């Protein structure tokens, strides 16, 4: 009781003030959000079924392009990587800053969200990619057009890079809960999708395999976690839509933690949400950069 009541007062008053800072910081953001951010992306003339056709049609610069996978749907914007490994890569998922929210419902994940590209400063075209999820219907359709390989790239807050290739990548339609299938793995980031969490043994490591999993969002539980508690869903915890199993080895669409290192008492539901890929940095590291891009196989 002596110097005890002393400390308890100090901390509570500190928190009080800190609540005043946050209330303050959130009020400002609300006001800045009374108007949107903007871009001006003049559309490049060359177009194609996807980035691979575009690069082959002579589109050799990495920027936003308009592609039409098929006469069915109308052409849509996408960011094409024409430099990494012979180009022709269609970015379907990108992370680099914490600008876009990935903890969305099923529909946004189906239609797509985020910014495909932004202005290169002084330029009329958008030669820089933004943070975005292309859309589940779109990703599924691209993969079912023919053999599709998948290139996953990442980087830590220090600048180290590691890739995770997949010779075969497919995503079934919505009717099949966008079921995912990958194979022919190689790379330096560790096969976190097929084999599972590198630092786990037997049963534990298995429940973290994504291959064969269905896509789940905080408002649509299709995880490999059979439970009764309406709060024990891999998407509600871990935040973000993904092919969660029980729960993950890789959390590409997780919360963007600034700095990389983060811990259980920082996480919302104490779980390991955050741009994670255990097979490389473990469960408590949030990649500075994370991206998923596709391309026809051959």
């Amino acid at each position: 009781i002596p110097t005890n009541l002393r400390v308890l007062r100090s901390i509570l008053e500190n928190l009080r003030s800190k609540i005043q800072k946050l209330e303050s910081d959130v009020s400002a953001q609300m006001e800045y959000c009374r108007t949107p951010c903007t871009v001006s992306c003049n559309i490049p003339v060359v177009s194609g079924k996807e980035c691979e056709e575009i690069i082959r049609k002579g589109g050799e610069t990495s920027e936003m392009y308009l592609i039409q996978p098929d006469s069915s749907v109308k052409p849509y914007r996408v960011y094409c990587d024409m430099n990494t490994e012979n180009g022709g890569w269609t970015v379907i998922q990108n992370r680099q800053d914490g600008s876009v929210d990935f903890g969305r419902k099923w529909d946004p994940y189906k239609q797509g969200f985020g910014n495909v590209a932004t202005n290169t400063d002084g330029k009329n075209y958008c030669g820089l990619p933004g943070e975005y999820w292309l859309g589940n219907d779109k990703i599924s359709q691209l993969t079912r057009m023919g053999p599709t390989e998948l290139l996953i790239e990442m980087e830590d807050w220090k600048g180290d890079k590691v890739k995770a290739h997949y010779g075969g990548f497919t995503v079934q339609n919505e009717a099949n809960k966008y079921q995912i299938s990958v194979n022919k793995y190689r790379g330096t980031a560790g096969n976190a999708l097929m084999d599972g969490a590198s630092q786990l043994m037997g049963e534990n490591r298995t429940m973290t395999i994504h291959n064969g999993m269905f896509f789940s969002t905080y408002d649509r539980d299709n995880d490999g976690w059979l439970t009764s508690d309406p709060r024990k869903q891999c998407s509600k915890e871990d935040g973000g839509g993904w092919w969660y199993n029980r729960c993950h080895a890789a959390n590409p669409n997780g919360r963007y933690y600034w700095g990389g290192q983060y811990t259980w008492d920082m996480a919302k539901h104490g779980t390991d949400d955050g741009v994670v890929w255990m097979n490389w940095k473990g469960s408590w590291y949030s990649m500075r950069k994370m991206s998923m891009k596709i391309r026809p196989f051959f």
């Binding site: 969490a197 786990l200 429940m207 973290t208 976690w225 729960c247 993950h248 779980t271």
Partner: peptide, 4 residues
Amino acid sequence: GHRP
């Protein structure tokens, strides 16, 4: 992570 996993949910053992």
